[PDB]
Amino acid sequence: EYARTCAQEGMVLYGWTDHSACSPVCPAGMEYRQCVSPCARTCQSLHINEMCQERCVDGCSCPEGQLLDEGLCVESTECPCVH
Amino acid sequence: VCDATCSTIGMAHYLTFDGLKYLFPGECQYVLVQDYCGSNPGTFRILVGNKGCSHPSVKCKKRVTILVEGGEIELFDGEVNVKRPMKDETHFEVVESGRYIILLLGKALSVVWDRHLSISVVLKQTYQEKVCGLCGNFDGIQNNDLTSSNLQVEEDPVDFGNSWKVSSQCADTRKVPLDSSPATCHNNIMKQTMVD
Amino acid sequence: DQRVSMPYASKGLYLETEAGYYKLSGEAYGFVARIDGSGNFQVLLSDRYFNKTCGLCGNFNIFAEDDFMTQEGTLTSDPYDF
Ligand SMILES: *[C@@H]1O[C@H](CO)[C@@H](O)[C@H](O)[C@H]1NC(C)=O
Ligand SMILES: [Ca+2]
Ligand SMILES: [Ca+2]
């Protein structure tokens, strides 16, 4: 709680969970980042930018690649199609 | 060849350039028309966005964000707002004449807005299959205006516009059971004649 | 009472998931709720409701103290009967 209460005030903190020996729970494939963008580049997405100027939000997300597809992180090579 | 014209006739309908009325009730933000389509530079990205508009009512105010020449001029609640002015201001123009907001953006682009819901973007002969979006490709062929973002023709428009939403994690709209009577006129055959 | 799927967008309330955690946005009405995996409610709310909203999360004023004003309107010292 103390992490977020300082983040909301205009001063964010970084990497505090590295040594704290407690990470908040999240489903498989993802773990807790800090200040990830809400507009997560997912798989079935349209490559448009500079509309998501929203503020930065904490929460768990995928690795550097490994795009999202239906609540799991999957590698960008295996992006499906839909019909 | 003449100058084509999209439209948004009412809350949830769309008339393509080549001429194809279809039904698409959505509540997310959708690409009405753009130019960054396949193998092109990508000059302009007119968008459209509705809120509480799956069922037409006194709700459903529209929001429109048009992105041309590195700009961001947008409009809702009657007035037009510039969030980021664009470089070549020479082509910009705004003609608040009458009930409409006519709005030029270049040699071959124009927008019209009745201050309430309608969006009638007008394009010139310049493009001729350089665009895509909910208004289609502007090629004359009238039965390929359902080419989704994943490059195939679909038959059901409610699966089409779901391909063109910006936020890929908002709610995709629901395949409604087809019928000649909408919700209020459903099993209210009296009222269905006073409206007809 | 009818269980719906998710996402969901009726009546101007987009019920999404962000960063693996569930969100309920009401920007037309001025609030953003969410829950995490463990279960930790959060309510981001417009400055608008200053000298205004009153509930279990207190009035959006400045005074951290006075923000136990009961449903009658009574500054109570106890954080519990409030
Ligand atoms: C709050 O509203 C009350 C009643 O109108 C007024 O007396 C008071 O000055 C207001 N205080 C602030 C901080 O605006
Ligand atoms: Ca066409
Ligand atoms: Ca307070």
Architecture overview:
This is part of a larger assembly, with 2 copies of chain A and 1 copy of chain B (196 residues). Helix content of chain A is 7%, strand content 5%. With 83 residues, chain A is mostly loops. Chain A is flat and about 45 Å long. Chain B contains 2 helices and 11 strands, in the order βββββββββββαα. In chain B, the strands form 3 sheets. In chain B, strands 4-5-6-7-8 form a 5-stranded antiparallel beta sheet, with no helix packed on it. Chain B has a 4-stranded antiparallel beta sheet with strand order 1-11-10-9, with no helix packed on it. A two-stranded antiparallel ribbon of chain B has the order 2-3. In chain B, strand 2 and strand 3 form a beta hairpin. Chains A and B meet through loops of A and loops of B. One calcium ion (CA) binds next to loops of chain C.
Name the overall outline of chain A: flat
From the spread of the alpha carbons, the general shape of chain B counts as globular
Question: What small molecules accompany the polymer chains?
Answer: 2-acetamido-2-deoxy-beta-D-glucopyranose, calcium ion
The main pleated sheet of chain A reads as: 2 strands, antiparallel
Written as H for each helix and E for each strand, in order along the chain, the element string of chain A is: HEE
PDB class: blood clotting
Keywords: blood, VWF, von Willebrand factor, von Willebrand disease, blood coagulation, blood clotting, multimer assembly, VWF assembly, D'D3 domain, D1D2 domain, D'D3 dimer, D1D2 Dimer, VWF Tube, repeating unit
Entry title: Cryo-EM structure of VWF D'D3 dimer complexed with D1D2 at 4.3 angstron resolution (7 units)
Chains A, C: von Willebrand antigen 2
